């Protein structure tokens, strides 16, 4: 034990350590030196009794590509404590509790515990100890706990627009410093107290970050954003404020994308649907709210889709076999080489037919379904599309398809390289055609006072068709089926597509409060709906206001 | 006799009652794609590339890796262990040179995390707690006298 | 890729790396002396994000240099003056930008080029009016979406 | 009354008093050393009204 570095013995043979105590002249801790020599030098080493490493497997692991082509799930090395004792090197405050949601806040590396922030030293990772306790130099590991009055076990961290921003439930936060980052500089203070359940990482997207908020038993996904007028005040609008009861309260993923400008949230309380949220911003204002199922079948449990720039890659269950699946938002394209006609199938495969399938006795080529796929199917309507204009629909058998996967078409279809898919179910109801009127401010409010005798709503459409239309009164149930183009049009061909252009007028006869127009179709064919009108006698007796 | 046209159809569900809600808002909508210029469309289909399974982890944690244009893989964190597909759908091998002992979890969605950069792909269990190990000390006793 | 001129330093971009020079002379990415960190050292700050951002073009406007990866934009400042320990390097937005054409000019705005399949969706990046340092990227092909191949 | 958590310090309220701790450890409302005011000392600001 020496009292300064200058008061130190000259030789002090090789296996020897001194606890240098503070000089009481600088603000210094009590570092150790450990002559090592072969070379007359006093270094700085670890404490004598304190131990260097963490349990070192319980720490977070990683997978590396390493260039054989196959991965390997390894522990990574953790740099041992060696600059002093305990506690001039305290144990970093995750050493009793669990870690989660690793930062990248600097060229430091950060951990989260409840309630702890554990940043590394700069410019090298996995060294959560100071380089030397001769002094606090700079760039030390950072242990700031939290600055709140309510229990916040401290989950996901997401960055946007100024900061990293470290979401517990019921607290959001601000992670800054006053100037540069030291261990004494980090701010770590509150922003809001919106409630966020922590099972899905809150995704993207542009300037906003989208929550997932817990209720019972219908989640209430918000939209977190910086307000316009203040510099550093944030707000979290609900974007399910008008669709509250819709998402079944278990959220394991928020997929999202930025190119096609939509958020999309999977759920696990009803796993067969991918919810959508299509939006766009013009002049810093919202102009489109949207919420929609995508439905893939009766029992098709959907694992988490993720979206490379304009391609949605989906993983599904059946529950016979799982499979990857691509959704491509390409407009006027061809999926598989050898179309007509992009075919909007659900679950296209260009399956060429092998040599031995045909028998000339019963005049039937037959296809075994998992010889196309490798999967057995629960339900759905398998449609089969030829490079010619042929389409056959098959309409799954009772206790199919697993009982008899057999796809019986025609006589001789061997070299035809045929297309096999499903049908999507496209459904779109309308709101009941009231008198929408935007007055007195905006916020378009109806007027339901007199009887609106409704007649012949009309739907106009761009370059596609063959949606039906179902008009559903209390007891009427009329169906206004529609096909592609008008007679004599250049679009209507004896073989090409049948697409057509609007409008289309069709009677919706009756009261407004009772007629529910909706559009189911099926199909292997697109549609477009641009606008919808309606006319009708209106007579309010009591001349209002 | 009155009439009015709803110019757009964007869009979606509105479970608010119909005398309150805006136009453009239907009461249900399945497989629709309310674009900006075109209105309602069918969602584009699922191509098959290709298949990988029998009903993989029963409920897994799946998180991709997107490094380059030629370098785009998955990571499926099942209840048993790590499984990796590419973006063409065939399996690629992972190895456990140090034992798994970290992915075996009843709920890998609620308990596993993955933070991913181009240099490292961190995998975080939330159930496990990290301790110091008493085996490796600097000096065993060292009475400093 | 995409060499800076951020100071009388000189900068490089890698994934994920910022490599600034020493000041007042170029092509010297090492300190003058390690007697101490003097000032004006080369700067090695990597990135501050949670998602993979191989780090392409950098363009300046109105306050800052502003270092565009895809799916991230950024803010390149310091707290006070620039040291190796001062550089901020934090996120702004997460708009998607394909990186084959350098985003040009022009006045107060900077114009993207955004990838789709198979019709691009060129945006317009600009500082908003009400906040001091919040940026937004409006689409200027929002009414002509299917037009650029 | 009404104990803080303002930092990894720990705070007390009296009339009129703010009594913060030293950082990184609780329940130590005294400086580590009076060789100098180092940093991270306990804080006794009363009120400004």
Numbering used by the authors:
A (entry chain v): 250 to 794
B (entry chain v): 3 to 57, 60 to 149
C (entry chain u): 349 to 497
D (entry chain w): 349 to 397
From the article:
Escherichia coli bacteriophage T7, a member of Podoviridae, has been used as a model for understanding the DNA packaging mechanism common to tailed phages and related dsDNA viruses.
The portal-tail complex structure is similar to the previously reported recombinant T7 portal-tail complex structure. The portal-tail complex was reconstructed at the same resolution of 3.8 Å, although the core structure was still smeared. Twelve copies of adaptor protein gp11 assemble around the bottom of the portal forming a ring-like structure and serving as the base for the assembly of a hexameric tube consisting of six copies of nozzle protein gp12. The dsDNA is embraced by the 12 tunnel loops in the portal, which have a weaker density probably due to its asymmetric interaction with the dsDNA groove. This dsDNA density terminates abruptly at the interface between the dodecameric ring of gp11 and hexameric nozzle of gp12.
